[PDB]
Nucleic acid binder design. Structure first.
Lengths: 52, 51, 111
DNA sequence: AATCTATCACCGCAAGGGATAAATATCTAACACCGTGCGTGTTGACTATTTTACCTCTGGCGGTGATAATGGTTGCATGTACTAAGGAGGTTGT
């Protein structure tokens, strides 16, 4: 009964509802990268292993 | 370098003259596949993918 | 019965003339054109149903006529027998069970 | 825009792989029967669908209390950087 607990939601609200999302924000271009020594910048293409 | 996130979204049912407000899935002929994933109370299941 | 006050007296939800706005001065064609649409759709379905049963299942509360009569002017248009004239207003619950039976009726919360 | 010799090779043309469709044999499903039980029908008695009537709820809102009470609260607009304007008034000048 911290789950089955209720709380007032002020005069104007009988009930409230929620959902949470595990958003798998994958590796992609336009996203940002860096290293420890102050190099900071955008991922500007993904290259085949030989395109390198 | 894939990252993982946890984020939150919410809704309400206001104090009406009776007291409750509605929560269900009826949105007919507007995007039906974006409805297929829900509880009796109009809510997604823990463990389901959504996009 | 305390929320009697607290439901509205804090800053007032959009309750047009509380609920009495359903029967007030708005009953003019500014609302009743939708009644003359729910009545049309119920007049459609309740005239494709069974040649006997299609009377009954319109009586008591205001469904289909400008005076939605008890027996005398309706029994004289049903013939043969009696208060099946009223029981079939409820019989629909059990072999009109098939929920598809409202497929052309439900729009009049929405127009 | 015709000619070809002389490239790098597709054809020249042997082999053989998979395929699918035939026949068989298995699966299931569609149905027709039967049985159940429910929502097939009228009738009848119930009790509380609605109306109106009556007797007597809830909540509309109007009305205003007296032993006496008779110098009040209110905190931070802002600290910088500029500079254009109006305001002051005595006076050494116009």
């Amino acid at each position: 009964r911290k789950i089955t607990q209720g709380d007032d939601l002020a005069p104007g609200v009988l009930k409230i509802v929620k959902v949470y999302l595990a958003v798998k924000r994958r590796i992609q271009p336009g996203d940002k990268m860096a290293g420890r020594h102050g190099n900071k910048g955008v991922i500007s293409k993904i290259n085949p292993i030989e395109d390198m | 370098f894939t990252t993982i996130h946890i984020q939150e979204l919410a809704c309400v049912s206001r104090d009406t003259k009776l007291g409750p407000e509605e929560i269900t899935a009826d949105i007919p002929n507007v995007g039906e596949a974006a409805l297929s994933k829900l509880d009796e109370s109009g809510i997604v299941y823990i463990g389901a993918e959504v996009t | 019965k305390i929320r009697k006050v607290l439901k509205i007296s804090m800053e007032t939800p959009i309750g047009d003339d509380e609920d009495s706005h359903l029967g007030i001065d708005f009953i003019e064609d500014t609302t009743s054109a939708t009644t003359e649409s729910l009545r049309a759709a119920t007049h459609d379905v309740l005239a494709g149903l069974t040649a006997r049963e299609a009377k009954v299942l319109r009586m008591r509360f205001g469904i289909d006529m400008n005076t939605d009569y008890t027996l005398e002017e309706v029994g004289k248009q049903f013939d043969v027998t009696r208060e099946r004239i009223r029981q079939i207003e409820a019989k629909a619950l059990r072999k009109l069970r098939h929920p598809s039976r409202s497929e052309v009726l439900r729009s009049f919360l929405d127009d």
